[model samples]
Target: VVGGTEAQRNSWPSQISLQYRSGSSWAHTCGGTLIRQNWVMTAAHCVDRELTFRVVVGEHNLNQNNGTEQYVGVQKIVVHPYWNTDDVAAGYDIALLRLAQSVTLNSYVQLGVLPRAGTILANNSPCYITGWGLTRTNGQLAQTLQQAYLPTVDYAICSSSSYWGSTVKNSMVCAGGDGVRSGCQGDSGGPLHCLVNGQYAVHGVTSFVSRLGCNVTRKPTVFTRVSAYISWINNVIASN
Candidate 1:
């Protein structure tokens, strides 16, 4: 994330590094949140390349081994059928990856708790966006994971003419338009963990940011509302 601080190894245990197999190595392409032993929640665009993908859990450093990493191959990818690659501005950008094998649960590897169906956060709700995305716009990915505090920007304000201008929908969550901390490249598909009722839940799947920069003022980081597709997510996993 841009203008973010390093994340503790155990702070966001469900955060994962979604990697693609290159010619001779794997590269971190996006971030995701583990929802189950074999299921990962992410953005559809992150899997558009159709490359051999893998989910790395318990990872902290992208360039070094923390000795707690669990690498699992993806068995299948389930992208939202209505997701349009050309129109991320129109919502429906979520996806799920099924791992070839169920990852073992540990202190550093755990499931992300998603909000209940139809749930929406109140304005200025406390939340944090975590990932290994870039530290600046058009910059390189962080060597270690990072996180930033970004309060919720309710739909009414986010969809206003001065903000996303009808581009933001209720099915999405907007946060961190503060021009300081926000999600950037490589953060797509990551989690917007929000605290509600005294517990933290995965409220969003990081989707996009301003075209001008990662942390542009009034251009909050947009995310796929996890609560908006609870039924769909359950259907996909149940069918598999």
Candidate 2:
């Protein structure tokens, strides 16, 4: 994330790295959340292509191997049927991927807890965005994971004329538009963990940043509201 520091190894257990097979090697393209032993929550745009993908859990460093990492192949991709890649502003940007095999839980690898079906964080509520994205606008990806404290920016404020205007929807979550900290390229599909009650829950899926720049003022990072699609997620898991 822009203007963020490296995250501790075991700090965000549910964060995942979504990679693609490159030549004879693998390369990280996006981030995701381990919602279940064999299910990952990501942005539909990340999987719009027909490339081979893999899921990596407990991945703190993308370039180097971590002892706690669990590598698994993607068995199926289920993008939201309503997703419009050319119109991410239309709001159906979330997706789910089924793993080839279930993963074993541990300190480093575990499931991500989602917020209540209809829960919405208040304005300026505590939250953080974690990923191995760029450290600055147009910069290269970080070798290790990074996190930025991104308080919730309610829809009313986010969709105002000063902000994203009509592009921001109630079905999306806006955070980190401080002009310094924000999600950059290569961080799509990561989690926006918002503090609720006593714990943090996966509240949003990182969707997009402004084309002007990732850390632009009043143009906070946009995410797909997880609570808005909880039912769809559950239905997909049960039927697939």
Candidate 3:
């Protein structure tokens, strides 16, 4: 997440990981955001099959090893019942994993709000996205948390015939400059935040096509608009 205005140092939130090891090596499986003490939101594609993984939270400097690392077993992996990889309505793109134990609430692992409908996120709107995904296409995953400031693109511009070609749905939003400083591979399931009421709220989740070499001026990164799922999220939370 891009911190600081154009003035001073802005602190971005730490990247959380759901990882595991097969023998002696660690493997990052998915990205998530720390919401409640025992609840985390991640892509259903990451945990749709299994509930076994470690939750690593609040890590900024991946190489420095300075940050809180929490390893907790998954209590449950809940995928959206209607989620279908083929159709946009599948809603299968999102999931919630209940942690076996709760972590202490902190600024680094706090809950984020949802954006209201019809709220226009403009080109000058300062937005930040963070993830541990690849720094380059066909490149190794970034060990440290990486972030970039992206401006929201106009929906019409994004949905034009030259862009997503009708793949852009109402449930989605576009941001970033083609491939310039945008979300990549490992950034999937991560948070896209914007300032609201002087606090950062998760407006979107990293999802969809993020080509590596695409022209930065042509393609934009697509994200799942969290507000559209508020009802679904509330129903799931209440049921669980």
Q: By lDDT, who's the top model here?
A: 1
Which lDDT value does model 2 have at 68? 87
Residue-level lDDT of model 1, residues 1-240, one tens digit each, is: 998899889999999999999999999999999999999999999999869999999999999989999999999999999999999988899999999999998889999999999999999999999999999998999999999999999999999988898889889999989999999999999999999999999999999998899999999999999999999999999999
Model 2 lDDT, full chain set: 0.94
Off by over 4 Å in 2: none
Candidate 1's displacement at residue 223, Å, is 0.2
lDDT for each residue of candidate 3 in 217-239, tens digit (9 for 90 to 100): 55677777777777777777778
What is the per-residue lDDT of model 2 for residues 1-240, given as tens digits with 9 covering 90 to 100?
998888888878999999999999999999999999999999999999899999999899888878889899999999999999999999989999999999889989989999889888889988899998888898999999999999889999999999999999999999989999999988999999988888989999999999999999999999999999999999999998
- Regarding lDDT, does 1 or 2 come out ahead? 1
List ranges where model 1 is wrong by over 4 Å: none
- Residue 35, model 2, lDDT: 96
- What TM-score fits each model? 0.99, 0.99, 0.84
Query: Could you tell me which residue pairs clash in candidate 1?
Result: none
